[PDB]
């Protein structure tokens, strides 16, 4: 299709490997580019961890409000929120907000630990029907995206389906789904990524991801004016370990989708 050719041209220009999955909920059509290839998730996996803790909270009433100690051994490589609470506490809701809206890596580690380790995040994915997602590590090593390493990967097709189920479907209870959407809409890290390719009057919730090999990711639910919501996953990774981030490539993918579908 025209969109497919434009995404191939984008990838050709980009210096890396591009993965796209778009679901248009108006007719449930899907557009994929490398949609069944595995890509390193990096920080986009924070959505699955936050959603898994929200699922826990459905049967543990006050779980999101219990204090979690932030100890010095907990601090990792990027802790814009948690470093302000060392030797103090943060609640699981505060940790989820920090992980999702600031991409705080210590916060995500606390979420992973609350779920019983990386396997607990993967188990939640399986429980909601995602057979592809795998989380294998914590931070700091989650920031590493070696080419061909299956750890901490998913496919664009699988992540788009999961993101749809979590935000628009029934994977979470109503209060939890609304909370997840509220957190994603308040992301602070995404302005140069999918959001930069979309009209400003459209509402977006998203989670970016970044890692080495110039890995630059974004997963988003989009509420355009005048049509039903869209789910868009854009994954991008490059051949050189020290490649520079390419949020602009994700914005181009979003622009191709916004203009062409």
TrEMBL record:
Hydrolase listed as a keyword: yes
UniProt catalytic activity: a beta-lactam + H2O = a substituted beta-amino acid
EC number(s) recorded for this UniProt protein: 3.5.2.6
Any Pfam family matching the protein: Beta-lactamase2
Residues annotated as domain Beta-lactamase class A catalytic: 19-234
PROSITE patterns attached to this UniProt entry: BETA_LACTAMASE_A
Keywords, alphabetical: Antibiotic resistance, Hydrolase, Pyrrolidone carboxylic acid, Signal
BP GO annotations: beta-lactam antibiotic catabolic process; response to antibiotic
Source superkingdom: Bacteria
GO molecular function: beta-lactamase activity
NCBIfam families: bla_class_A, blaCTX-M
Family membership noted in the UniProt record: Belongs to the class-A beta-lactamase family.
PANTHER family hit by this protein: BETA-LACTAMASE, BETA-LACTAMASE-TYPE TRANSPEPTIDASE FOLD CONTAINING PROTEIN
Protein name, as recorded: Beta-lactamase
Source organism (scientific name): Escherichia coli
Name of the gene encoding the protein in the UniProt record: CTX-M-14
């Amino acid at each position: 299709s025209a969109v497919q050719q434009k995404l191939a041209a984008l990838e050709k220009s980009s210096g890396g490997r591009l993965g796209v999955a778009l679901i248009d909920t108006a007719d449930n059509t899907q557009v994929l580019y490398r949609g069944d290839e595995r890509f390193p998730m990096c920080s986009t996996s924070k959505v699955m961890a936050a959603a898994a803790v929200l699922k826990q909270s459905e049967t543990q009433k006050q779980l999101l409000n219990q204090p979690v100690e932030i100890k010095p051994a907990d601090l990792v490589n990027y802790n814009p929120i948690a470093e302000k609470h060392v030797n103090g506490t943060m609640t699981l809701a505060e940790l989820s907000a920090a992980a999702l809206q600031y991409s705080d890596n210590t916060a995500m580690n606390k979420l992973i630990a609350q779920l019983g380790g990386p396997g607990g995040v993967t188990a939640f994915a399986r429980a909601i029907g995602d057979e592809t997602f795998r989380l294998d590590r914590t931070y700091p090593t989650l920031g590493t995206a070696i080419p061909g390493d299956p750890r901490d990967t998913t496919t664009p097709r699988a992540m788009a389906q999961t993101l749809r189920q979590l935000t628009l479907g029934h994977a979470l209870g109503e209060t939890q789904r609304a909370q997840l959407v509220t957190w994603l809409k308040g992301n602070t890290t995404g302005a140069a990524s999918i959001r930069a390719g979309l009209p400003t009057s459209w509402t977006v919730g998203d989670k970016t991801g970044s890692g080495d090999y110039g890995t630059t990711n974004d997963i988003a639910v989009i509420w355009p004016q005048g049509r039903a919501p869209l789910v868009l996953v854009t994954y991008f990774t490059q051949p050189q370990q020290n490649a520079e981030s390419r949020r602009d490539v994700l914005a181009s993918a979003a622009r191709i989708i916004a203009e062409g579908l």
